[PDB]
Amino acid sequence: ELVTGIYVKYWIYVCAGMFIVVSFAGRLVVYKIVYMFLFLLCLTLFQVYYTLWRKLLRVFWWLVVAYTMLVLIAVSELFSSILIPGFFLLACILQLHYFHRPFMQLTDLELDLAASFSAVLTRIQVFVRRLLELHVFKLVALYTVWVALKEVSVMNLLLVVLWAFALPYPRFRPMASCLSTVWTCIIIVCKMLYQLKIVNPNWFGVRKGYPNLGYIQNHLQILLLLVFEAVVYRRQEHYRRQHGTRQRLDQDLLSCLKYFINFFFYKFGLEICFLMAVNVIGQRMNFMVILHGCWLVAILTRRRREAIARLWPNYCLFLTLFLLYQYLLCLGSTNLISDFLLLLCASQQWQVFSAERTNPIPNFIHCRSYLDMLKVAVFRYLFWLV
Q1: Using CA atoms, how far apart are residues 117 and 239, in angstroms rounded to an integer?
Q2: Distances (CA, A) of 356 to 28, 129, 269, 308, 352
Q3: With 111 labelled, which of 123, 177, 179, 222 sits at a CA distance of 20 to 30 A?
Q4: Signed CA dihedral, 359, 363, 364, 370: sign only
Q5: Distance (Å, whole) CA 268 – CA 191
Q6: Which residues are CB-neighbours of 270 under 8 A, at least 6 positions away?
Q7: Which of helix, strand or coil describes residue 364?
Q8: Rg of the chain over CA atoms, in angstroms?
Q9: 193, 219 contact by CB (below 8 A)
């Protein structure tokens, strides 16, 4: 057949996502929300324990059973609660059992636009794996965008500091990534446990979530980004287990574009670092930015090549030593957001500085191809343009 495979493979993750976010369709009650909270925590522990990702089907079936039991011994007002959690529990149980019996084993390893679609998917997966550190940084980015651009979370400094020492260090990055996933799960547990009605009502910032919908998205998107990173790592391992040159770049326009996109930061990196530092100093307008630009012009002082490289690990070190203290002093801005973005670019540079793996110039004095018709302009016209 055709449709039965597509309906039998995309079952468990979408059903768990529908069943876990369908909680809290009601007033202040601990009865129905803590089930979905413990379900999301169990899914996070299953993903992060790296051996029980799909090998606790007893626990999944027992969670479905407890959900159905609560939905059948609990439930214009008595027509949506029994239709939400009843059907949700039944669908979850059916999905979990069916997937475990056939879909889980098959997935695990113990008009022709579809080929282009799959090739673009594989290439985006490859770039995600190469940019896994960058993807984690983008998760730090949305973290601070909820933290320092929407509202400071419950000791958000701890998570932004986990990010801060995760950025420049590759020995830290995976372990502090998993510890950040764990701390975000604990933060979501404490967030959904704080909306109670027995509260009897500056280093804590318990914001007392009123509407019981807005005080969860800053942790829901966090766990969703951690789960998208874990799913991208798992799909990268699965696609690895299944299934131009740096000197040939100047042969075709496509080859030049490919050698650009592969190495867009390679011999451009410190340039873009200086550019992002300049944009941050322009945008912040503070004496903290005055000291930042002082150290930036000090880094620029060592014009000679390889001198800056020595100071660049110390550059990342005082960058994180400045940014973490800045966030803690703001606790008790968007300028700090772009400063964290600059520190992220500088950490990426401090990573890829030491890449020790790795003359048709008179051709580029006349136009013999499109590549050199643009090459001559870049070499000569740009100087006049500047």
Answers
A1: 15
A2: 59, 21, 15, 17, 9
A3: 123
A4: negative
A5: 42
A6: 308, 349
A7: helix
A8: 26
A9: no
Hey, what amino acid is at 65?
A: V
Segments in the chain forming alpha helices (H): 3-9, 12-20, 30-49, 57-74, 85-98, 104-107, 113-130, 132-147, 156-166, 173-192, 217-241, 253-262, 269-284, 287-301, 307-331, 334-352, 370-376, 382-385
Given a contact cutoff of 8 angstroms between Cβ atoms, the answer to whether 147 and 162 are in contact is no
| Cβ 266 vs Cβ 355: under 8 Å | yes
The experimental method is cryo-EM
Contacting residues for 60 by C-beta, under 8 A, at least 6 apart: 96, 100
Count of CB atoms situated within 10 Å of the CB of 228: 13
Write down the residue that tokens 């280093």 correspond to: 203
Q: What is the resolution of this structure in A?
A: 4.5
